[PDB]
Amino acid sequence: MRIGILYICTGKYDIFWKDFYLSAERYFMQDQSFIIEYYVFTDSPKLYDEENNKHIHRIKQKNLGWPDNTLKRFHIFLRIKEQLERETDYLFFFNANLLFTSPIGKEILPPSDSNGLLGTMHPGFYNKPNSEFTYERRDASTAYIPEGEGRYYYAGGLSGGCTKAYLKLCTTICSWVDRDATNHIIPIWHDESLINKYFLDNPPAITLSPAYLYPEGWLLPFEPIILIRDK
Numbered sequence: 001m002r003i004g005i006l007y008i009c010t011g012k013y014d015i016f017w018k019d020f021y022l023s024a025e026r027y028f029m030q031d032q033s034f035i036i037e038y039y040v041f042t043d044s045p046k047l048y049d050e051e052n053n054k055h056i057h058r059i060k061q062k063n064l065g066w067p068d069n070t071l072k073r074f075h076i077f078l079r080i081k082e083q084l085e086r087e088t089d090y091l092f093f094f095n096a097n098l099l100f101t102s103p104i105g106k107e108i109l110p111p112s113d114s115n116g117l118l119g120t121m122h123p124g125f126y127n128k129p130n131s132e133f134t135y136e137r138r139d140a141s142t143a144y145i146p147e148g149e150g151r152y153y154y155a156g157g158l159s160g161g162c163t164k165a166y167l168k169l170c171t172t173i174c175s176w177v178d179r180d181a182t183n184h185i186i187p188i189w190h191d192e193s194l195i196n197k198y199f200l201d202n203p204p205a206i207t208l209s210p211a212y213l214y215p216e217g218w219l220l221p222f223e224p225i226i227l228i229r230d231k
């Protein structure tokens with residue numbers, strides 16, 4: 001019924017919201033079965049259409065700068081954590097620069113009987129062998145994986161699940177994030193690095209193809225469902 005969308009645009013990144021939002025209204029989960037809430041974490045004063053729409057929730061979040069912008073992701077999600085458990089059945093995170101090209105239905109929702117959790121295959125690694133996966137390799141990070149270990153390389157920019165299951169992931173990973181800071185370790189790919197470990201312990205109930213991560217200006221043997229805008 002309810003779909004929480006988590007979205008972060010700080011500094012200039014807010015220039016992505018307008019279109020992400022618009023496309024979402026056309027394509028993403030449009031069935032009267034679903035009510036979509038938008039949690040948009042930003043330091044910008046006003047979003048687009050934020051005045052007319054009651055489902056656009058601006059959350060005041062200052063600019064953390066790179067990498068902490070991406071690194072602190074679950075720290076930032078967890079501020080409204082209690083709100084999130086109230087208002088949403090499912091959560092999904094989109095990288096700021098995504099654009100919906102095609103209709104997305106209930107096909108992507110993890111079942112009940114599952115662990116249900118969702119992840120997308122990184123577009124750069126879908127055609128490569130796991131030696132080529134950019135997994136954090138220092139056993140000093142929480143995000144470390146043994147060489148020749150792991151099934152897929154998962155992307156930072158789209159993830160989700162049952163609200164209860166994806167939050168456990170935010171807190172769990174949020175903690176790993178914190179442990180590494182105590183060791184002065186920053187995983188190589190940051191949150192992506194860490195989510196891949198979690199999805200190693202936790203194979204995701206749904207693994208979406210790279211079509212959902214299709215880069216703008218790459219040729220790939222899929223139809224793009226979701227597109228990645230190029231800066």
Ligand SMILES: C[C@@H]1O[C@@H](O[C@H]2[C@H](O[C@H]3[C@H](O)[C@@H](O)[C@H](O)O[C@@H]3CO)O[C@H](CO)[C@H](O)[C@@H]2O)[C@@H](O)[C@H](O)[C@@H]1O
Pocket residue numbers: 122123124125134155156189192215228
């Ligand atoms: C899709 C890509 O996302 C950002 O960069 C990601 C980076 O992309 C590499 C990819 O790893 C490589 O295999 C492919 O052939 O070329 C891309 C070069 O851009 O991959 C790492 C994983 O190691 C992270 O996922 C990075 O976020 C972005 O900055 C790129 O512009 C592009 O949109």
